[PDB]
Amino acid sequence: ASCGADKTLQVFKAETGEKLLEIKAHEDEVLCCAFSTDDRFIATCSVDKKVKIWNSMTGELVHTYDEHSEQVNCCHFTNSSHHLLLATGSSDCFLKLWDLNQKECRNTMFGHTNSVNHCRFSPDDKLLASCSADGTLKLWDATSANERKSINVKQFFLNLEDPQEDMEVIVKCCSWSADGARIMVAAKNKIFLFDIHTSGLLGEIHTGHHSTIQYCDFSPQNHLAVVALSQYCVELWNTDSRSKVADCRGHLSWVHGVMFSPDGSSFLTSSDDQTIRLWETKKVCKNSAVMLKQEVDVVFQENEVMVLAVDHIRRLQLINGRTGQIDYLTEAQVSCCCLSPHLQYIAFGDENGAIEILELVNNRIFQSRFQHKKTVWHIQFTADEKTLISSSDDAEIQVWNWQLDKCIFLRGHQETVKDFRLLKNSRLLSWSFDGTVKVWNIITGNKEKDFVCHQGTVLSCDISHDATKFSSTSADKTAKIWSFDLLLPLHELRGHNGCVRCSAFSVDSTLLATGDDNGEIRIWNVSNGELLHLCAPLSEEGAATHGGWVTDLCFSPDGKMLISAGGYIKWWNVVTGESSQTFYTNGTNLKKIHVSPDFKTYVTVDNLGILYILQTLE
Amino acid sequence: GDVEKGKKIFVQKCAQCHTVEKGGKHKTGPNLHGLFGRKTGQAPGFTYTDANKNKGITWKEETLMEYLENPKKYIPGTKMIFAGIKKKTEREDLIAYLKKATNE
Ligand code: HEM
């Protein structure tokens, strides 16, 4: 059984994967739910405070409870077949040990100094463990309706320069040993295995790198630990042995939760997308160094297309399409990368903002540039093989010629320059957080034409690429467009009260898409502007999943088609209706567009799903 | 909005990941002091996602009203976990409280 934000709960039999239960509503948004030990009941926690224990078979309500001063944190039926109790944590910090055989609570239990994080009955029904943000375990004596034991948790020792003394551990999951005789837990940067019966620490499984745990899950089999540290980092660790077994890429939205089968042979994976992925236990252990890194740059030189990649462990590997030809390289984790014009070189940024340009002919030859307060942002090369150009936290736009080691700067006096692009001339287009659409010069810094198209930041600005005849931008205000000849845009489109978020020019035509936040596109003729039929690519959908963001538009060479890419690719026919809408991406959330000069093949990698290559046939 | 109710909502739903006082520490989320009239992703000393860092909007009542209804929808890929405040009144109250407290 899974609930949701709607607060309806749906109960299902996983095998045949077919609806086995529909529940009409739960008052207030569901907070959590759970089966009875004999699966004869289903408790349902909620913000309302209506502990609705519906029958698991008839589906009709049986038990119901309320006592909490605040919203319930957790509900669970007694693991014992005999005793019928309902331990319930809540934001009011008070535990409520319900007697399921009675309408009123068997025992209120103040104890936690912070709101309860999780709650479970102990295999010994006489005992009742509990957890909370203070992090200390609390093994209550339910039989006496009184405190018995409560391990302190400062075991995550960490002597930082932090003014706070010993760290205040915040345990989340209340994991149990398969016998339940001891309590596995996890918090911050470390898993622990406390022995509540002796009231002392035993195990301590450190998590990957350092941060603060968002989710964790012990596995009684194989001493496994499926832990979602942060950003859906659902690694498969191995407890006690204290070493990772294997990586598990594949949830979008950063997981929302995971739990193993009672057999332990499988586990569910609830996620923010609204998705639950079943998984076999065996598959996770095996290694699978795949699924390229989420953001990459690909450069297309004809018949074979090469995609930029970040190594699964360290730097990078270049894998050409239609081949197994890996091209690994070494560096202390490159921040970003860029190939030189007319090939012959390769380059990368750094966390310090330093930017090396390794030669292809010889690994010994390189130039390293030290610049920028932080990691370098945008990087672009001149039409000449020489002269690096870059930007970052600095207000200035860096122009560092390599070999010559020249350091020309674009002194824009901005808080920072957000991004910049090459113009067909010696001019260098740019824009910052003040939303100025500056027109500088390449190599030599010189702000020749200056535009203030937006008081706010330039959200997405696209330049057409035939001559320098036009350029346009939209930034949650107006879709301005100019020919550079004027200091102000030739037209200021105002056809969208919801304000256009992004725009892209036609492939040497007269079309000009204007993307909305909801993925809506409004095509505009490159002639001041006129009420052209909106491309209107998405009309009916909802908040389902993999849909947010109007990242890019890829016009067909014919110009008769727009390749919209938000939650998934859809080839919306230009002006009214759609052409080849179909597709549907596995990853979702593509953020980049690459097109071959021919325009035959575009491959998208979205959400780290992987890179997908398309090659239409006859 | 009702600033007092807004405070309650902040205490209940935001305080576990964010401070509003000047020099208040970064918790899971960034300190919100000075939020109004500031562009997304600018609290110095907080490491944002690229999505939040590049949303490119100015925080103010209109943008907050939309964000707080459904953060993920407004900034897909945000690492902020929050379903959203579905009732407008509560949103207005919270926003009115934040407007006061994040300047104070
Ligand atoms: C109604 C209550 C909340 C309010 C008013 C609030 C306010 C905000 C705002 C305005 C931002 C973006 C500001 C900016 O771009 O600098 C933000 C980001 C964030 N919030 Fe919240 N927040 C709330 C609840 C939460 C909760 C419950 C969590 C965690 C449980 C959280 C953690 C975060 C994080 C991690 C970010 C950074 C987003 C990113 O870097 O991708 N917030 N919050």
PDB file of C-alpha atoms in Angstrom, chain A residues 276-429:
ATOM      1  CA  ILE A 276       7.877   3.215  -7.430  1.00  0.00           C
ATOM      2  CA  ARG A 277      10.559   0.989  -8.907  1.00  0.00           C
ATOM      3  CA  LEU A 278      10.751  -2.661  -7.931  1.00  0.00           C
ATOM      4  CA  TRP A 279      14.248  -4.139  -7.721  1.00  0.00           C
ATOM      5  CA  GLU A 280      15.786  -7.585  -7.315  1.00  0.00           C
ATOM      6  CA  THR A 281      18.321  -7.944  -4.489  1.00  0.00           C
ATOM      7  CA  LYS A 282      20.913  -9.643  -6.714  1.00  0.00           C
ATOM      8  CA  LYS A 283      21.146  -6.875  -9.323  1.00  0.00           C
ATOM      9  CA  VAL A 284      22.299  -4.134  -6.939  1.00  0.00           C
ATOM     10  CA  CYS A 285      25.466  -5.912  -5.773  1.00  0.00           C
ATOM     11  CA  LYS A 286      26.868  -6.326  -9.295  1.00  0.00           C
ATOM     12  CA  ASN A 287      28.765  -3.281 -10.541  1.00  0.00           C
ATOM     13  CA  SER A 288      27.404  -1.148 -13.383  1.00  0.00           C
ATOM     14  CA  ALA A 289      29.732   1.764 -14.141  1.00  0.00           C
ATOM     15  CA  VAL A 290      27.404   3.309 -16.723  1.00  0.00           C
ATOM     16  CA  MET A 291      24.818   6.085 -17.099  1.00  0.00           C
ATOM     17  CA  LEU A 292      26.896   9.084 -18.179  1.00  0.00           C
ATOM     18  CA  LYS A 293      27.047  12.180 -15.956  1.00  0.00           C
ATOM     19  CA  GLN A 294      24.099  14.555 -16.150  1.00  0.00           C
ATOM     20  CA  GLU A 295      25.656  17.622 -17.784  1.00  0.00           C
ATOM     21  CA  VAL A 296      27.964  17.145 -20.760  1.00  0.00           C
ATOM     22  CA  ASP A 297      29.061  18.993 -23.887  1.00  0.00           C
ATOM     23  CA  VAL A 298      29.029  17.215 -27.271  1.00  0.00           C
ATOM     24  CA  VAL A 299      30.789  18.486 -30.432  1.00  0.00           C
ATOM     25  CA  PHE A 300      29.683  17.264 -33.875  1.00  0.00           C
ATOM     26  CA  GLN A 301      32.216  17.000 -36.689  1.00  0.00           C
ATOM     27  CA  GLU A 302      30.228  15.010 -39.309  1.00  0.00           C
ATOM     28  CA  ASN A 303      29.568  11.175 -39.683  1.00  0.00           C
ATOM     29  CA  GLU A 304      30.450  10.277 -36.078  1.00  0.00           C
ATOM     30  CA  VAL A 305      29.295  12.373 -33.086  1.00  0.00           C
ATOM     31  CA  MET A 306      31.403  12.495 -29.884  1.00  0.00           C
ATOM     32  CA  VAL A 307      29.742  13.229 -26.501  1.00  0.00           C
ATOM     33  CA  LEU A 308      31.649  14.850 -23.624  1.00  0.00           C
ATOM     34  CA  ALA A 309      31.617  12.702 -20.486  1.00  0.00           C
ATOM     35  CA  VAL A 310      32.621  12.803 -16.821  1.00  0.00           C
ATOM     36  CA  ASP A 311      34.265   9.665 -15.457  1.00  0.00           C
ATOM     37  CA  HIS A 312      32.190   7.604 -13.038  1.00  0.00           C
ATOM     38  CA  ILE A 313      35.063   7.856 -10.565  1.00  0.00           C
ATOM     39  CA  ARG A 314      37.283  10.827 -11.447  1.00  0.00           C
ATOM     40  CA  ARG A 315      37.778  12.857 -14.637  1.00  0.00           C
ATOM     41  CA  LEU A 316      36.378  11.722 -17.983  1.00  0.00           C
ATOM     42  CA  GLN A 317      36.109   9.222 -20.827  1.00  0.00           C
ATOM     43  CA  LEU A 318      35.274  10.038 -24.417  1.00  0.00           C
ATOM     44  CA  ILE A 319      33.093   7.377 -25.968  1.00  0.00           C
ATOM     45  CA  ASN A 320      32.285   7.924 -29.627  1.00  0.00           C
ATOM     46  CA  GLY A 321      28.907   6.727 -30.825  1.00  0.00           C
ATOM     47  CA  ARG A 322      28.653   3.495 -32.807  1.00  0.00           C
ATOM     48  CA  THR A 323      31.828   2.180 -31.146  1.00  0.00           C
ATOM     49  CA  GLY A 324      33.314   0.873 -27.900  1.00  0.00           C
ATOM     50  CA  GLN A 325      36.244   3.265 -28.177  1.00  0.00           C
ATOM     51  CA  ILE A 326      36.578   4.712 -24.664  1.00  0.00           C
ATOM     52  CA  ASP A 327      38.995   7.652 -24.336  1.00  0.00           C
ATOM     53  CA  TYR A 328      39.912   8.079 -20.664  1.00  0.00           C
ATOM     54  CA  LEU A 329      41.942  11.035 -19.346  1.00  0.00           C
ATOM     55  CA  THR A 330      43.339  12.012 -15.940  1.00  0.00           C
ATOM     56  CA  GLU A 331      42.890  15.180 -13.855  1.00  0.00           C
ATOM     57  CA  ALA A 332      41.823  16.033 -10.298  1.00  0.00           C
ATOM     58  CA  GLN A 333      38.119  16.061 -11.225  1.00  0.00           C
ATOM     59  CA  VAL A 334      37.538  18.483 -14.101  1.00  0.00           C
ATOM     60  CA  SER A 335      34.799  21.051 -13.471  1.00  0.00           C
ATOM     61  CA  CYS A 336      33.868  21.571 -17.123  1.00  0.00           C
ATOM     62  CA  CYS A 337      35.364  20.982 -20.571  1.00  0.00           C
ATOM     63  CA  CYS A 338      35.699  22.463 -24.065  1.00  0.00           C
ATOM     64  CA  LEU A 339      37.373  21.363 -27.302  1.00  0.00           C
ATOM     65  CA  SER A 340      39.438  23.763 -29.415  1.00  0.00           C
ATOM     66  CA  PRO A 341      38.333  25.107 -32.815  1.00  0.00           C
ATOM     67  CA  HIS A 342      39.627  23.009 -35.735  1.00  0.00           C
ATOM     68  CA  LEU A 343      40.366  20.247 -33.205  1.00  0.00           C
ATOM     69  CA  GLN A 344      44.041  19.663 -32.300  1.00  0.00           C
ATOM     70  CA  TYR A 345      43.417  20.471 -28.623  1.00  0.00           C
ATOM     71  CA  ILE A 346      41.240  19.745 -25.596  1.00  0.00           C
ATOM     72  CA  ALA A 347      40.500  21.891 -22.533  1.00  0.00           C
ATOM     73  CA  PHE A 348      38.943  21.904 -19.075  1.00  0.00           C
ATOM     74  CA  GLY A 349      38.113  24.191 -16.160  1.00  0.00           C
ATOM     75  CA  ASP A 350      38.809  23.739 -12.454  1.00  0.00           C
ATOM     76  CA  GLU A 351      37.328  24.351  -8.998  1.00  0.00           C
ATOM     77  CA  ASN A 352      39.754  27.256  -8.605  1.00  0.00           C
ATOM     78  CA  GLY A 353      38.613  28.579 -11.980  1.00  0.00           C
ATOM     79  CA  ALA A 354      41.928  27.570 -13.527  1.00  0.00           C
ATOM     80  CA  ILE A 355      41.570  26.402 -17.126  1.00  0.00           C
ATOM     81  CA  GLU A 356      44.047  24.036 -18.787  1.00  0.00           C
ATOM     82  CA  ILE A 357      44.182  23.385 -22.533  1.00  0.00           C
ATOM     83  CA  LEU A 358      45.940  20.051 -23.100  1.00  0.00           C
ATOM     84  CA  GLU A 359      47.297  19.469 -26.608  1.00  0.00           C
ATOM     85  CA  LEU A 360      46.206  16.305 -28.427  1.00  0.00           C
ATOM     86  CA  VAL A 361      49.561  15.779 -30.140  1.00  0.00           C
ATOM     87  CA  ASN A 362      51.397  15.713 -26.812  1.00  0.00           C
ATOM     88  CA  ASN A 363      50.210  15.340 -23.223  1.00  0.00           C
ATOM     89  CA  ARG A 364      53.290  17.195 -21.955  1.00  0.00           C
ATOM     90  CA  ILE A 365      52.196  20.482 -23.539  1.00  0.00           C
ATOM     91  CA  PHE A 366      49.546  22.505 -21.727  1.00  0.00           C
ATOM     92  CA  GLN A 367      48.688  25.992 -20.497  1.00  0.00           C
ATOM     93  CA  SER A 368      46.995  26.459 -17.102  1.00  0.00           C
ATOM     94  CA  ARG A 369      45.152  29.692 -16.288  1.00  0.00           C
ATOM     95  CA  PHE A 370      44.542  30.756 -12.691  1.00  0.00           C
ATOM     96  CA  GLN A 371      41.523  33.020 -12.380  1.00  0.00           C
ATOM     97  CA  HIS A 372      38.036  33.545 -10.873  1.00  0.00           C
ATOM     98  CA  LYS A 373      37.132  33.492  -7.185  1.00  0.00           C
ATOM     99  CA  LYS A 374      35.322  30.180  -7.657  1.00  0.00           C
ATOM    100  CA  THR A 375      34.738  27.505 -10.292  1.00  0.00           C
ATOM    101  CA  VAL A 376      34.682  28.915 -13.828  1.00  0.00           C
ATOM    102  CA  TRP A 377      31.264  29.219 -15.487  1.00  0.00           C
ATOM    103  CA  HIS A 378      30.894  29.563 -19.253  1.00  0.00           C
ATOM    104  CA  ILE A 379      33.869  28.761 -21.482  1.00  0.00           C
ATOM    105  CA  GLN A 380      34.172  29.530 -25.180  1.00  0.00           C
ATOM    106  CA  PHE A 381      36.928  29.812 -27.773  1.00  0.00           C
ATOM    107  CA  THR A 382      37.431  32.383 -30.540  1.00  0.00           C
ATOM    108  CA  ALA A 383      37.242  31.533 -34.244  1.00  0.00           C
ATOM    109  CA  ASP A 384      41.020  31.520 -33.943  1.00  0.00           C
ATOM    110  CA  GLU A 385      42.517  28.383 -32.401  1.00  0.00           C
ATOM    111  CA  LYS A 386      44.022  30.768 -29.840  1.00  0.00           C
ATOM    112  CA  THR A 387      42.452  32.788 -27.004  1.00  0.00           C
ATOM    113  CA  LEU A 388      40.399  31.191 -24.232  1.00  0.00           C
ATOM    114  CA  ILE A 389      37.344  33.096 -23.039  1.00  0.00           C
ATOM    115  CA  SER A 390      35.605  32.420 -19.713  1.00  0.00           C
ATOM    116  CA  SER A 391      33.587  33.847 -16.820  1.00  0.00           C
ATOM    117  CA  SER A 392      32.589  33.110 -13.216  1.00  0.00           C
ATOM    118  CA  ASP A 393      31.920  34.930  -9.942  1.00  0.00           C
ATOM    119  CA  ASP A 394      34.035  37.865 -11.134  1.00  0.00           C
ATOM    120  CA  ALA A 395      32.167  40.864 -12.543  1.00  0.00           C
ATOM    121  CA  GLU A 396      34.664  40.872 -15.394  1.00  0.00           C
ATOM    122  CA  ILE A 397      34.484  38.495 -18.341  1.00  0.00           C
ATOM    123  CA  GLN A 398      37.829  36.730 -18.607  1.00  0.00           C
ATOM    124  CA  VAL A 399      39.622  36.521 -21.931  1.00  0.00           C
ATOM    125  CA  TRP A 400      42.799  34.542 -21.386  1.00  0.00           C
ATOM    126  CA  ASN A 401      44.748  33.837 -24.546  1.00  0.00           C
ATOM    127  CA  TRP A 402      46.701  30.609 -24.043  1.00  0.00           C
ATOM    128  CA  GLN A 403      50.403  30.029 -24.790  1.00  0.00           C
ATOM    129  CA  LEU A 404      50.756  33.805 -24.993  1.00  0.00           C
ATOM    130  CA  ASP A 405      49.120  33.719 -21.547  1.00  0.00           C
ATOM    131  CA  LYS A 406      47.370  37.020 -22.293  1.00  0.00           C
ATOM    132  CA  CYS A 407      44.785  38.243 -19.792  1.00  0.00           C
ATOM    133  CA  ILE A 408      42.436  40.726 -21.454  1.00  0.00           C
ATOM    134  CA  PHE A 409      39.390  41.462 -19.278  1.00  0.00           C
ATOM    135  CA  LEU A 410      35.837  42.603 -19.997  1.00  0.00           C
ATOM    136  CA  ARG A 411      35.242  45.074 -17.174  1.00  0.00           C
ATOM    137  CA  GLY A 412      31.443  45.018 -17.087  1.00  0.00           C
ATOM    138  CA  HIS A 413      31.097  46.269 -13.494  1.00  0.00           C
ATOM    139  CA  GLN A 414      28.241  43.793 -12.986  1.00  0.00           C
ATOM    140  CA  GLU A 415      27.627  41.865  -9.764  1.00  0.00           C
ATOM    141  CA  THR A 416      28.653  39.100 -12.111  1.00  0.00           C
ATOM    142  CA  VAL A 417      28.199  38.330 -15.789  1.00  0.00           C
ATOM    143  CA  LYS A 418      25.790  35.412 -16.067  1.00  0.00           C
ATOM    144  CA  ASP A 419      26.729  34.173 -19.525  1.00  0.00           C
ATOM    145  CA  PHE A 420      28.215  35.140 -22.894  1.00  0.00           C
ATOM    146  CA  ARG A 421      28.306  33.953 -26.507  1.00  0.00           C
ATOM    147  CA  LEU A 422      30.232  34.521 -29.747  1.00  0.00           C
ATOM    148  CA  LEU A 423      28.864  36.861 -32.403  1.00  0.00           C
ATOM    149  CA  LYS A 424      29.655  36.557 -36.120  1.00  0.00           C
ATOM    150  CA  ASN A 425      31.738  39.733 -35.882  1.00  0.00           C
ATOM    151  CA  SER A 426      34.594  40.450 -33.490  1.00  0.00           C
ATOM    152  CA  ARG A 427      31.786  41.344 -31.095  1.00  0.00           C
ATOM    153  CA  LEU A 428      31.181  39.189 -28.015  1.00  0.00           C
ATOM    154  CA  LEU A 429      27.571  39.032 -26.798  1.00  0.00           C
TER     155      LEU A 429
END
